[PDB]
Amino acid sequence: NLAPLPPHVPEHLVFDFDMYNPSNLSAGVQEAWAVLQESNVPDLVWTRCNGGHWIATRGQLIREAYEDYRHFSSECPFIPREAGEAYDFIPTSMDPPEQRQFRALANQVVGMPVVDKLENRIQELACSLIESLRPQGQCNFTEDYAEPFPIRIFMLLAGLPEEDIPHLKYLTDQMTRPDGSMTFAEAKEALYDYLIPIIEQRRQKPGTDAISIVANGQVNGRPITSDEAKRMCGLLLVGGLDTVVNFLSFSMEFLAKSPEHRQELIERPERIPAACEELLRRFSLVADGRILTSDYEFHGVQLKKGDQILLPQMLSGLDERENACPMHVDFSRQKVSHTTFGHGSHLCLGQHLARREIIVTLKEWLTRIPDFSIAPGAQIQHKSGIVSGVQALPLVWDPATTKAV
Numbered sequence: 141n142l143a144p145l146p147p148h149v150p151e152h153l154v155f156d157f158d159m160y161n162p163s164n165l166s167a168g169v170q171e172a173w174a175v176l177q178e179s180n181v182p183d184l185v186w187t188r189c190n191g192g193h194w195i196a197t198r199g200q201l202i203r204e205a206y207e208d209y210r211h212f213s214s215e216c217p218f219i220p221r222e223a224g225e226a227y228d229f230i231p232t233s234m235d236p237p238e239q240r241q242f243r244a245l246a247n248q249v250v251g252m253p254v255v256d257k258l259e260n261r262i263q264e265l266a267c268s269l270i271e272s273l274r275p276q277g278q279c280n281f282t283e284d285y286a287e288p289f290p291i292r293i294f295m296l297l298a299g300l301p302e303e304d305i306p307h308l309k310y311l312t313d314q315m316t317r318p319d320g321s322m323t324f325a326e327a328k329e330a331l332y333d334y335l336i337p338i339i340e341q342r343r344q345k346p347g348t349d350a351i352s353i354v355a356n357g358q359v360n361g362r363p364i365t366s367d368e369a370k371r372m373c374g375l376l377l378v379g380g381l382d383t384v385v386n387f388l389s390f391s392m393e394f395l396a397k398s399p400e401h402r403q404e405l406i407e408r409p410e411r412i413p414a415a416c417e418e419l420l421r422r423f424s425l426v427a428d429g430r431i432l433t434s435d436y437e438f439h440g441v442q443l444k445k446g447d448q449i450l451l452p453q454m455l456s457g458l459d460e461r462e463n464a465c466p467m468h469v470d471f472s473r474q475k476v477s478h479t480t481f482g483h484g485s486h487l488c489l490g491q492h493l494a495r496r497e498i499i500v501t502l503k504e505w506l507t508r509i510p511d512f513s514i515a516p517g518a519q520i521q522h523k524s525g526i527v528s529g530v531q532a533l534p535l536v537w538d539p540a541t542t543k544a545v
């Protein structure tokens with residue numbers, strides 16, 4: 141449906157892009173979003189889809205808006221409006237100044253020091269999942285690796301049972317790529333229904349898991365409330381269950397389709413960290429945004445207090461004004477410009493865990509299964525939303541070309 145055009149929005153800026161079902165989706169989701177960067181499309185457009193909102197289409201504007209939290213508030217960061225209003229996760233639903241104190245606590249559970257306590261288990265799980273698949277000569281990559289690898293690591297970190305994954309993954313996905321059966325508010329309250337008692341049990345009897353550490357944490361020297369803990373833990377679950385999970389499939393689809401790039405990383409494994417960064421640029425996948433706190437003229441466009449603006453993190457690095465030949469993957473690219481992990485005060489806190497999971501996957505997969513392809517006659521379908529993904533990724537290989545370590 142197309143919402144009525146607000147009185148302050150001129151017709152010439154109207155471009156009815158649907159972030160949950162973009163028209164060019166069959167080309168690939170990044171390609172579908174990149175239609176917003178065709179030469180005739182303004183830097184800032186209005187879509188009547190999903191209740192009506194602005195979209196900044198160029199890295200310059202996306203970066204500026206993410207830096208200016210005084211005009212572009214995180215209080216209502218999701219489209220549609222109902223979802224942004226219900227959205228209350230911490231720290232993401234807060235602006236500075238109050239946001240900042242919560243970042244340190246989140247860093248205690250997903251930050252670089254914690255990656256250190258997990259490196260060996262991350263390594264061991266990647267290797268065991270890949271070795272189990274290796275002799276089969278085929279897999280459904282989304283279900284067989286992309287999901288279980290990051291999700292089981294998160295569930296370990298959080299001290300949550302693996303048999304809870306199907307329920308939690310379903311709920312998480314309703315917040316980013318809703319199937320229509322639940323509103324954001326319903327999904328969020330179901331997630332909170334799961335968490336609240338676990339949080340109370342771990343405040344009564346603390347363990348060493350991430351939920352215990354958040355629930356018994358301090359924020360700038362005072363105790364976190366049960367409610368704040370819940371709102372932080374919800375966000376951590378969503379990051380654990382619906383970010384890397386999707387990104388790995390874009391990356392593995394690319395490698396399945398580009399033997400040259402596989403060989404590069406096999407021959408020059410020192411390049412894997414750089415490859416991770418270039419893949420994070422090319423297969424960027426997040427798009428949230430902000431709400432206007434006041435009327436504001438931005439790049440010659442009149443914005444009105446309460447207007448939502450989508451600021452797609454995905455688009456900055458695909459912008460030819462940020463990177464030449466942006467749809468080309470070049471592992472030797474000298475300045476890999478992107479906002480894949482966000483920009484401004486809300487920079488991703490999970491990014492070190494994400495990079496470790498990506499780099500481990502690339503190294504351990506190519507060590508064992510250097511030669512693989514998309515299954516015969518398969519046409520890979522993507523899906524779009526707050527976080528975009530790959531619906532299915534059937535891969536095949538000849539087991540004779542693989543190596544058990």
Ligand code: HEM
Pocket residue numbers: 214217230231232233239243246250294375376379380383384387425426428429453479480481482483485486487488489490491493494
């Ligand atoms: C490829 C993987 C990932 C990508 C692309 C990604 C992307 C992002 C983006 C774009 C933001 C900023 C959102 C905004 O400004 O509104 C963000 C924030 C955040 N992410 Fe990540 N993320 C990833 C992985 C993770 C993981 C694995 C976790 C935790 C398990 C995580 C936890 C967080 C947290 C806690 C924030 C909030 C920071 C704040 O609001 O101050 N992320 N992420």
Ligand SMILES: CC1(C)[C@@H]2CC[C@@]1(C)C(=O)C2
Pocket residue numbers: 229232316375378379383426428526527
């Ligand atoms: C936009 C995000 C990727 C970031 C971490 C999880 C996510 C869906 C959020 O709600 C904040």
Ligand SMILES: [K+]
Pocket residue numbers: 215216217224225226227228233
């Ligand atoms: K809100």
